[PDB]
UniProtKB/Swiss-Prot annotation:
One of its GO terms (biological process) is thyroid hormone transport. Changing residue 80 to N: Gary; severe thyroxine-binding globulin deficiency. Belongs to the serpin family. This is Thyroxine-binding globulin. It comes from Homo sapiens (Human). The gene is SERPINA7.
Length: 372
């Protein structure tokens, strides 16, 4: 039940956070894992008390009258268990960790609870050595992501006390892989009104769920992975990116779920990779997480020691889109005449990667320029 309520709330948080990012960095690539951020902040909240705690979950979009705190905590336990369960043909792990200055001692019950509930690991770190601390954090993340997310954290100020990190590991195959013999190099991709970049353009004629949204002035194309997950490509009409961004919400996803229809599409999709790195504090504080960052932070559920507060919450997300899926691997031959409409993704678009069993947003972003 809680898992069901969480989907809409987590999606609205995703889009609200996305909009915060557009105002921090206008007209630049955006790419992050909403569900991983949500889960990490619920974990952090598990060690917080009073307003420090309620600020976090309310900023995530929850109403404590509707979903009591313990229900949220257990709903996210169930979510992580579900997403991270081993599945054939899909690797999916969301995860997080805390790095805490060595002078502060976490409560053993907290450590054991968050490992059990959320798979979280917690490390004692000497933040007086900034380069060493960054390497420790980044090595942890690189190992947890089987090497895919490298250099997640880039900046730490002196007097760092606690760092939250969150990440996602994702490996998947398209239900309908592209034939690499049809991939065209150096196709033109508009990164703004007048500027083009050259990108390889994959090409497949197949049946896809898609729609033309007359209200929001965009075309939506659904491409399934072979297990659990799917991609939505959101292609705004000329000059309509801003109106699309403003409209994205859990209500919009519900509308599209109903209106998507299947048919033949002569489809052209760029082959590319995207990444982005964030220090989330700026946005999260604006969105309402204040006490956790202050000298009055109440982390009594985390430690009996005085002086614990959040210093930084860091996140990096990366994804490849290629002929097979997420991996640069061969497409076996076995796995591959009326006039059909063309959808050509040759200009800036929004991208969602969704997980079906839990209705989580694994990745959300805007591809302004696919050639980083
Ligand atoms: N129809 C197919 C394909 C599909 C899956 C998902 I996941 C999705 O994204 C959401 C996200 C939220 I949040 C919702 O409340 C709803 I309804 C759909 C959409 I669009 C389409 C299915 O379900 O397998
Ligand atoms: F196939
Ligand atoms: Na296949």
């Amino acid at each position: 039940a809680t898992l069901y309520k969480m989907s809409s709330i987590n999606a609205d948080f995703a889009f609200n956070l996305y909009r915060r990012f557009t105002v921090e960095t206008p007209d630049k690539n955006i790419f992050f894992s909403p569900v991983s951020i949500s889960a990490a902040l619920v974990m952090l909240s598990f060690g917080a008390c009073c307003s420090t705690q309620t600020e976090i979950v309310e900023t995530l979009g929850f109403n404590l009258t509707d979903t009591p705190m313990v229900e949220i905590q257990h709903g996210f336990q169930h979510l992580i268990c579900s997403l991270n369960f081993p599945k054939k043909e899909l690797e999916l792990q969301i995860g997080n960790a805390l790095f805490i200055g060595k002078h502060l001692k976490p409560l053993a019950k907290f450590l054991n609870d968050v490992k059990t509930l959320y798979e979280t690991e917690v490390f004692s770190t000497d933040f007086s050595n900034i380069s060493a601390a960054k390497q420790e954090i980044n090595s942890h993340v690189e190992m947890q992501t089987k090497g895919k997310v490298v250099g997640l954290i880039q900046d730490l100020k002196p007097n760092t006390i606690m760092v939250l990190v969150n990440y996602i590991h994702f490996k998947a195959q398209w239900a309908n892989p592209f034939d690499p013999s049809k991939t065209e190099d150096s196709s033109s991709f508009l990164i703004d009104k007048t500027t083009t970049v050259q990108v390889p353009m994959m090409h497949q004629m197949e049946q896809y769920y898609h729609l033309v949204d007359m209200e929001l002035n965009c075309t939506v194309l659904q491409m399934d992975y072979s297990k659990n997950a799917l991609a939505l490509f959101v292609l705004p009409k000329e000059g309509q990116m801003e109106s699309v961004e403003a409209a994205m919400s859990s209500k919009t996803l519900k509308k599209w779920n109903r209106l998507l229809q299947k048919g033949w599409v002569d489809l052209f999709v760029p082959k590319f990779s995207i990444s982005a790195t964030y220090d989330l504090g700026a946005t999260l504080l604006k969105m309402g997480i204040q006490h956790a960052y202050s000298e009055n932070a109440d982390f009594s559920g985390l430690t009996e020691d005085n002086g614990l507060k959040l210093s930084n919450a860091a996140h990096k997300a990366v994804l490849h889109i290629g002929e097979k899926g997420t991996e640069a691997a061969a497409v076996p031959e076995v796995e591959l005449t009326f006039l059909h409409p063309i959808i050509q993704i040759d200009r800036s678009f929004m991208l969602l990667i969704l997980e079906r069993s839990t209705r989580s947003i694994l990745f959300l972003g805007k591809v302004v320029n696919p050639t980083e």
